[PDB]
């Protein structure tokens, strides 16, 4: 077996889950257009009653130039003109823990 669920049983498992979730359905035939319209209006869902989206759409210069000029040949600050994650610190902590644990045996 190994795996918790072989693919071939996926359809049966989903069928049983759906049967459990929806135990009762509306299975009463109508007789004309008005009844169907009324039933559609009655059964509307809050989550499926939105509206269609909207179409997709598209003096200080001297100071900025002076700042840009003064920041010439700056290796790092020039490009910007920042989400720390502390990855090196965590790597150091992990390696220190591993080394100490190994030294525990010896």
């Amino acid at each position: 077996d190994h795996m918790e669920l072989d693919p071939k049983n996926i359809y049966e498992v989903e069928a049983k889950i759906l049967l459990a979730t929806y135990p009762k359905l509306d299975l009463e035939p109508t007789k004309n257009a008005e009844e169907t319209i009324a039933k559609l209006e009655k059964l509307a869902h809050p989550e499926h009653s939105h509206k269609p989206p909207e179409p997709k759409v598209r003096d200080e210069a001297l100071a900025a130039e002076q700042e840009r000029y003064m920041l010439t040949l700056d290796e790092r600050l020039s490009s910007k003109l920042w989400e720390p994650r502390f990855e090196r610190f965590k790597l150091i902590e992990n390696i220190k823990q591993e080394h100490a644990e190994k030294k525990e045996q010896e």
Partner: peptide, 30 residues
């Protein structure tokens, strides 16, 4: 067994245990 898998999944999800019409009809019947 499918029943065991279904039960496990369901537990993991916290599933607790007006007059013109009548006139025309009457004419068509007459």
């Amino acid at each position: 067994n499918l029943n065991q898998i279904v039960t496990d999944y369901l537990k993991k999800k916290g599933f607790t245990r007006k007059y013109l019409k009548a006139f025309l009809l009457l004419k068509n019947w007459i």
